[model samples]
Target: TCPFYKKIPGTGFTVDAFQYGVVEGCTAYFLTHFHSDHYAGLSKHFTFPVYCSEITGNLLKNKLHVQEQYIHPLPLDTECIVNGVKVVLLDANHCPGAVMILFYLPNGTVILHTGDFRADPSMERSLLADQKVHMLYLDTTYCSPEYTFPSQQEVIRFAINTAFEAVTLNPHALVVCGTYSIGKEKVFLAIADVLGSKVGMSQEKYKTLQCLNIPEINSLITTDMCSSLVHLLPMMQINFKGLQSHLKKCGGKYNQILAFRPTGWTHSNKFTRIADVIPQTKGNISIYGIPYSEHSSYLEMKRFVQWLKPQKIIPTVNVGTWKSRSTMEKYFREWKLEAGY
Candidate 1:
């Protein structure tokens, strides 16, 4: 996922390629989500027409301080003319404001670009179930046999159950969850709901979450960390050293620390079917790496590919690295054969 080719071949639309300043032939920029990696080089100075979901547009303006003039927030499932081409936005199921961009070319040709999505079976109904996509720009982040994960519902339930059990065992344990700006919200949100506790986070983070317009979170959010049993911090602050220092600074308020480091890296083997949640522990501090991924797994991607039956596949992630790209391409070939194409 390095700085590689992003401009769609023979198209004026640049999808999720903003790192470079003022792309030469890009007539319009299409952003599928508001993740930092996708919108790195975007600023107020770069004046270009950007098309994204309404939520993603609000995030770009409020969080990134990008101006409203350039951001054209399109509603979901509506066809809009962008540079004389038809474009539509569908839910990506990855995170808040994430969308799968669909383009309807001039001569009945359809293109689907899934921007870091967690593909589910439900997507088949609205995502052109009968229509055959000509080109599929996929997010092949976990494009390997070794990488597989449970559904978002199952994973969130597992996290909630795990937290309940852990806290039930240690009554004085404080549950600290590690998260990015967006995504993995269901984990902590469900955990808080089941545990009947509030989430403590910084005012800046609270304001950012507020921009998402989650009214339920407003009641659960607390800037004063002491008032809540659970605290939400950045992913980088969940390490052993950082947690240890955090525990010390709290001054015995919590006897045992239960830190949840949720990631997509927790793959399943034949032996461990549930998950590899219990990672490591030091004294009373326990770290659980929940297998809650926003990206589709290898099998999940295969399932999507089989169902989609796209004419051509253009992988987005792991493309710069030749070996990795080829390795993933091998799976695509096998899947193409399975799709009887």
Candidate 2:
């Protein structure tokens, strides 16, 4: 059995991964997002038809080179039936095209798979009002109390403001925003809208964005780095090597380069206020970590569990051992009181 994938015994549906191939008694597969970790074992050779959002299906077919016929797009908030099981998709509030899947079994059992999501009150209310959940597959990335962070919207505002303030202080300084492919589209879109300037992306990224068919965002993609003051790069490229390479290419056209990395790990294992800005600078590049995360914090997860009131909680992480299940069971039990059960 694969640790990353879970099966609904008699329901014939598998969530994430293709551990058991299509003919291995599995009817269909459900993908909650396009994150590599979630789709770890998936590739172009996959033969099963996977249900996911339109954008996610596009990415799987276009970016990952998966076959077109293997993708089945599911609209958000709409209930559809497959193999006599009722399924509904909800906005996950994580990255682009992320979704929370709700499955209703014939035995009156309701299963909720929270596919890497942050807690939103409106969604929580709607989910709780429905049938009681029998099992909850949770995204326990930050299941410890030490991980306390503000909302994504709050972090987005801070990141945009930081970029604006940096550019205002130094007009010649170029703003380099670091993000995953589909992760921080909201942050870059907000910047593009507010600053009235397009965000620069590599050719590969531009092609991926073009497949999304988002008119507002499609018009904002530019390959000309110097044409726009903001340049968007992958998270890994926001480092010193990347900055130096960019400097060499530009030949010192810009006096300084300000880099903003938006992620939860910015304050991971540490305590920081909501609006605090922690800055670090290299020779000609300034770096700042913005606590913008797509996953729910510890407190938010507790509150979400209390609201949903699932009969059992299953952590979705693969903790690297055969005893992972027992360890997670004990971890959840220790925090049962905080989860309001």
Candidate 3:
């Protein structure tokens, strides 16, 4: 029932390994990214050799403590032959070390699995240059019309500007921006650059950022709590109650605590999106949720499929579920008819 791993018919290749762990039945296994949903069930005990990007391999070895012998790192955009099948990795743009796996079958069929990525025009240069994509396993996280949101770059700019404004208005306040363990480094880095302030992170978040090995980011890390005016916090900690609890215990070290959460849910039906920003505040605690998602939106997904014109489209989620089934069928029904397949 897991959606992360699937066997490529007639190719002897299995894409990703999920809760079932690894199977010796496939010729080789490919890992698209290091997200928990994709990397679930993977551990140091995993016996099967897996192919993935160099960054992902590093995390697997250093963080996950998986043996180096079981992890094979592949350079992006370079084709490598593995077990008689040709494979290439493209930037997924979802997060650090994420990739879209492309396979060239011996039978002249091309398969693309877009792990979890935002669609970009530049991807076409590497993906659809010579051969047509015969099949596509798409990331359908935002398949509904309600997911319409601004581009990531736009949202990041808005978030940084908004954060700067907050800090300027309340100079003594501490800024707390929420992000995932892997993505949204750009947001923190931008805020750091524009404000000339270092970003404080928890020990765990700092370790993950340290693995990226970027000098610009490394220079801005501060281990002490009150050492830096700006802090990058985990998404889970940005809730209203969490902020209240934190502010009450801070001992007036900060005049206020400004929180920002960048996500697509900001534009969902539950929330109203005005001018591409939505925020709710309670006294000295404020949280802004921006639409800074990494997945392709509803229209973007439609354009991607239409542009690729793949012979088959397989969703990366369980279509047996009502939401996935209805969204996938309703959006592409006309395309399927036009293609006459």
Query: Which candidate comes out best when scored by TM-score?
Result: 1
lDDT of 1 at 95: 82
* Worst 10 contiguous positions by lDDT, candidate 3: 267-276
Clashing pairs in 2: none
TM-score of each: 0.93, 0.90, 0.91
Which is the better candidate, 2 or 3, if ranked by lDDT? 2
Better of 2 and 3 by TM-score: 3
User: Candidates 1 and 2: which is better by lDDT?
Assistant: 1
**For this target, which candidate reaches the highest lDDT against the unseen true structure?**
1
Per-residue lDDT over 132-211 for candidate 3, one digit per residue giving the tens place of the 0 to 100 score: 88989888888777777777777677777877887788778777778776886777777777777888878877877776
Which stretches of candidate 2 lie above 4 Å from their native place? 19-23, 213-215, 267-269, 321-331, 334-341
- Quick one: RMSD of model 1? 2.1
RMSD of each: 2.1, 2.5, 2.5
TM-score of 2: 0.90
Candidate 1 vs 3: which has more lDDT: 1
- Model 1 segments beyond 4 Å from truth? 1-5, 267-271, 275-277
